[PDB]
Amino acid sequence: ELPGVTEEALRLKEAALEELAAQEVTAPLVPLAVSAFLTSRKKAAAAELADWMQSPEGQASSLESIGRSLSRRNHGRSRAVVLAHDHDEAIKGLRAVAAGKQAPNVFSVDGPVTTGPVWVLAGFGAQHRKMGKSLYLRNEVFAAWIEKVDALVQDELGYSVLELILDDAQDYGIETTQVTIFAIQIALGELLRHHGAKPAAVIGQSLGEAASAYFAGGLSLRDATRAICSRSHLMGEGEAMLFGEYIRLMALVEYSADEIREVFSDFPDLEVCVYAAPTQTVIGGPPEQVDAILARAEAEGKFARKFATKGASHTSQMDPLLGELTAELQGIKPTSPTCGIFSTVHEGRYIKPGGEPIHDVEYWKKGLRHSVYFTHGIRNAVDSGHTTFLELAPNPVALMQVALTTADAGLHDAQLIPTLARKQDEVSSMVSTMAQLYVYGHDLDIRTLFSRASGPQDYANIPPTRFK
Ligand SMILES: OC[C@H]1O[C@@](CO)(O[C@H]2O[C@H](CO)[C@@H](O)[C@H](O)[C@H]2O)[C@@H](O)[C@@H]1O
Ligand SMILES: OC[C@H]1O[C@@](CO)(O[C@H]2O[C@H](CO)[C@@H](O)[C@H](O)[C@H]2O)[C@@H](O)[C@@H]1O
Numbered sequence: 001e002l003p004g005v006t007e008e009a010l011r012l013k014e015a016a017l018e019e020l021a022a023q024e025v026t027a028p029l030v031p032l033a034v035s036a037f038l039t040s041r042k043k044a045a046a047a048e049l050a051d052w053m054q055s056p057e058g059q060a061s062s063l064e065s066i067g068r069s070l071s072r073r074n075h076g077r078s079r080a081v082v083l084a085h086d087h088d089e090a091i092k093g094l095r096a097v098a099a100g101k102q103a104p105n106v107f108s109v110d111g112p113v114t115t116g117p118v119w120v121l122a123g124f125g126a127q128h129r130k131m132g133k134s135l136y137l138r139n140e141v142f143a144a145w146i147e148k149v150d151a152l153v154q155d156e157l158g159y160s161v162l163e164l165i166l167d168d169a170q171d172y173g174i175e176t177t178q179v180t181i182f183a184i185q186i187a188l189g190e191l192l193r194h195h196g197a198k199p200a201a202v203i204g205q206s207l208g209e210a211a212s213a214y215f216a217g218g219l220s221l222r223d224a225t226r227a228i229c230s231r232s233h234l235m236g237e238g239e240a241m242l243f244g245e246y247i248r249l250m251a252l253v254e255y256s257a258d259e260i261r262e263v264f265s266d267f268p269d270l271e272v273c274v275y276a277a278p279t280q281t282v283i284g285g286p287p288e289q290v291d292a293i294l295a296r297a298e299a300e301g302k303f304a305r306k307f308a309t310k311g312a313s314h315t316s317q318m319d320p321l322l323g324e325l326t327a328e329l330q331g332i333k334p335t336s337p338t339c340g341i342f343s344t345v346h347e348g349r350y351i352k353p354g355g356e357p358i359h360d361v362e363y364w365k366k367g368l369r370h371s372v373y374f375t376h377g378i379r380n381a382v383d384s385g386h387t388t389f390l391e392l393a394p395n396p397v398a399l400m401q402v403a404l405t406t407a408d409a410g411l412h413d414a415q416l417i418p419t420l421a422r423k424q425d426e427v428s429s430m431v432s433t434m435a436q437l438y439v440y441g442h443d444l445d446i447r448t449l450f451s452r453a454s455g456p457q458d459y460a461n462i463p464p465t466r467f468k
């Protein structure tokens with residue numbers, strides 16, 4: 001028997017629900033799907049729906065009942081979704097679909113994407129104080145998976161991530177950022193799976209690698225949790241003890257791998273942490289050298305930004321942690337992947353579903369110690385026909401990096417699908433995510449975005465649920 005939800009988590013939850021119950025109710029975001037074999041007919045159906053929605057009978061029908069009725073139609077090759085809070089927004093969106101015009105809350109394509117989605121599991125720099133809290137309180141599938149990870153992390157490290165999520169007075173550090181984002185990644189992905197979705201492949205970046213291993217069927221949930229827990233506390237404890245000459249900084253610079261090779265001849269202790277994008281690289285090393293490369297970049301009109309850490313992951317500074325990381329991971333059981341993996345640990349190379357296991361102890365050591373070939377993984381995915389990249393995160397930081405690589409590789413219309421974001425309603429964000437999966441033809445049962453009807457008022461008087 002794993003540990004249950006702590007008394008403190010329950011106390012915090014109760015206070016959070018009381019705060020929620022006293023807030024003004026916001027209109028939900030409802031997905032309205034239309035489709036046909038031909039785009040011309042799709043546009044006609046959008047126009048007919050808009051005209052009906054303008055009528056007195058249409059105006060008296062809830063958006064939810066309209067959306068539910070639309071979800072039970074046949075879903076053709078040419079698809080569109082209008083995301084709306086009220087009838088005016090719905091009608092404007094539908095008019096744009098009918099006219100072939102773009103609009104912020106409208107997705108419309110002539111046919112399905114050819115290859116399945118790549119799930120992107122990153123995390124660094126995505127965290128914020130209240131991440132995951134709103135969705136935890138309002139979505140029971142998400143909540144159940146958060147609690148499952150919370151129990152496992154309690155067992156491994158002896159504290160509750162759910163307490164961190166629910167207590168607005170608490171914020172995240174090097175350790176707790178990692179385990180909490182991992183929990184959110186697991187819960188987001190399983191929420192998606194609950195609605196019929198699945199990755200065709202995964203790609204990880206540094207803390208995200210552990211979640212990527214789980215979704216690729218390479219480790220059980222328990223063993224993926226061991227992978228993130230081990231690196232998280234070692235990193236956090238190691239970094240807190242660094243002072244003076246032991247400090248190693250990390251910084252994003254606008255230099256490519258090829259530029260780095262030349263630039264580094266002047267800085268003998270700098271190392272590459274992350275190849276993030278074609279012209280963006282995260283570097284690490286002694287403060288004086290990091291400051292000098294930043295100064296060189298600014299003098300050449302290139303972007304450069306220092307991260308808030310006294311330690312550099314993915315450098316030789318990790319060497320003293322590796323023996324303990326080894327000991328703590330003894331007994332994990334790497335399994336044969338059930339989807340593709342672009343391994344940014346193994347220089348961005350692809351591993352097919354059903355291939356040999358990769359996620360052994362040496363994998364986690366190499367992962368922590370050596371560079372992250374992120375841009376290389378994305379490029380390999382683009383070169384093998386992938387166009388949809390879906391990021392599981394509290395904020396879509398990595399998607400910006402993906403967009404740079406996709407554009408550089410000649411793909412100018414990638415489907416870049418975020419999940420959560422700070423300052424965005426978390427329930428609405430997930431509606432949008434799943435609507436996009438539907439529009440592009442990826443696995444997703446749009447019927448499950450609506451609760452089961454309990455009466456005729458839960459349908460609208462349109463096909464296929466006209467009242468006789
Ligand atoms: O939740 C808002 C409201 O609750 C109080 C208690 O009435 O504090 C609870 O919520 C805080 C935010 O998560 C916690 O830090 C605190 O521990 C908890 O008691 C109020 O102080 C707050 O305004
Ligand atoms: O080790 C000398 C060698 O490294 C340089 C490179 O800029 O400096 C670094 O090494 C020093 C230790 O000897 C540190 O004090 C310093 O922080 C670090 O950048 C030069 O001193 C020389 O070429």
Ligand SMILES: OC[C@H]1O[C@@](CO)(O[C@H]2O[C@H](CO)[C@@H](O)[C@H](O)[C@H]2O)[C@@H](O)[C@@H]1O
Binds near residue numbers: 075437438444
């Ligand atoms: O075209 C089938 C294809 O569409 C998806 C969504 O992209 O599912 C839709 O079509 C199903 C009927 O074929 C419905 O059951 C479902 O509700 C709807 O989303 C994919 O999941 C499916 O492979």
Ligand SMILES: *S(O)(O)Oc1ccc(OCc2ccc(NC(C)=O)cc2)cc1
Binds near residue numbers: 123205274282313
């Ligand atoms: S691992 O354990 O997560 O260590 C690590 C530190 C830093 C990394 O940088 C990738 C990155 C992240 C964010 C941004 N942009 C922001 C914060 O705005 C650029 C590059 C990766 C791994």
